[PDB]
Structure formats: structure tokens, C-alpha cells
What does this fold into?
Amino acid sequence: MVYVSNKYLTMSEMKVNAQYILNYLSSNGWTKQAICGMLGNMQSESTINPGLWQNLDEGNTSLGFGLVQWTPASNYINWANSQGLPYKNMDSELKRIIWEVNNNAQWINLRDMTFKEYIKSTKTPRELAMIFLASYERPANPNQPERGDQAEYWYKNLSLQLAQFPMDIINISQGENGSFSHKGTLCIDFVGKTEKYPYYAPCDCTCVWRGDASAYLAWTSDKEVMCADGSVRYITWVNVHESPLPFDVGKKLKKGDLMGHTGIGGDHWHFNVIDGKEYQGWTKKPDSCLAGTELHIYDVFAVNNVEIINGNGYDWKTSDWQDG
Ligand SMILES: [Zn+2]
It folds into this structure.
């Protein structure tokens, strides 16, 4: 959903557009600050409307058009045609801006910042709105602090999850460095209240590997998460012993969705988590665990609303972090 028209948008309609642009350019590696600094500008140029002609003068290609009011409009519209993109279109316009960053276009460095620098900046959305104004837009009237106020407003009004321990109970049958099969590892075997006991997604995640032989699924958090130890990081983990395996590679789960059950794939759940967003298969040291940097389960996942029955004397922590 985007609002595209030759008419001034209300704040409700702009908010929808502003959210869309945030989502799109976020995936393209721009910072929330720089996107909002641009939004403050596009609010003044266009009410964040990709279909808007300057002064509502439809079809006048000598005047401004679209989100940043490309002037003359034909420079953009012609670029769009050459690129096989429909010109009056949100994504096409965002693709034009990305192109300008990638091709040393539009921007003039008047504030000791290049366009490539701009999109990675974490200066205030106010600061960056004014940098954008001076460098990209270059208006005849430079005194427009409202673009800054608008930037900071979109920063606050648009758009971390706390990693929650998957299961309702903690009851450890074999901890980190356990003698039977965890020597050298930070793995933990957990049992449920019964056989085949459910556990849930600690955060939005995706299934990245399936080992049918060894009965494991591997998962990677979609975003960086907030950990029980106050760390912010991507995480990757493995669930072993479920039978049959619930999902396939690519499967997407939201925080709290059913992720698996204990099993015999004695009934239990072997769990192991590493730092980062890269699954790297396995190693033995001397016992089997994930390759990569193992993290303590009790430092990563919070135990809010978990019944601890055993325990193993680990620093299990609750967290007051509130999910975005
Ligand atoms: Zn184990």
C-alpha cells in the first residue's frame, strides 16, 4: 500500500508512505536517521507523494515531480523510461534515489559529507535533514528548519525484540560441558513437563538448515535482537531431537510461534546458540556443537514467566526490555 496521486497528502496518508520508504531503504542499508532526514525534506517538497506534480501542474515536465520534486521532472521520468520502470511509482522513485547515491549524482558536498556518507550517518535526524537540504535540494530559500522538525517527528513516530527463552520450564538433564556428550560445548539438554513438550520462537527467525540425519533444524534471527545480558546482536541456534522435523529450510516464524517439541529424534531438547547471522555447520571439541562463537543460553535468552525447576545454578535472568 502506497498513496500515489497529484494531490497533497494528509498526515495519515504521509505516515503510510513514510513507513513504506523506511522499510524499503532500511533493507537497502540506509540508517533510520538519514531516511528520516530525507523524509523531513520530502514532506516539505511533496507531502511524501510520489505522484505529485509541482503546484499540482500535471504533465508539466519542466517543473518538479514526485517525492523530492525532481526538477525538471523529465530528468527522472527519462531515467525511469531508460530503466524500464513506470515513472509514477513509489519504488521507481526510491530506485532513482539509490541510483543517485550509487552514481555520484544530484548531491553536492557543501556540508563535508558525501551522499554515500549521508546514508550511513547516525547524526540526529534534525542535523541530517539540514545537510540533505543544503546538499541535495539546494533551495533558493535555505531557511527551512521545519524540515528538521519533521525529520525528528518521523524518527519518533515510525517503526528490538527481546530474545525470549523458548520453553515454559527450565529443567536441565545435561548442562554446558556435561560429561556424557557436551564436553567443550555450551549446549544444554532440556526436558519438558512431559514427553514431546512444545517450545516457541524466541524472536522473528528463519529456518536456515535442516539435518535429517541428526534430527536438527537451524534458525537465524531475522534482525538483531536484545539479549538477556543487555547485548544487541544477531543470533543463530540449533534445535535437536524433534521427530519428525516440523519445518523446512526457509520457514519463517514470528516471535512466540511454535518452533518445535522435545523428542527422541530419553525425550528432550538439545539447544545450542552462537553469535551472528551465519550458520557454519558443526564441530567436535571433543563433543559435538555448532561451529562459530557459542554463547551462553542464559545470557542470550530471558526467562520472564519461566518456571525454573533445574536450574544447574546458571545466571538465568529476566529482562524488562519492551519489544518494538
Ligand atoms: Zn545435548
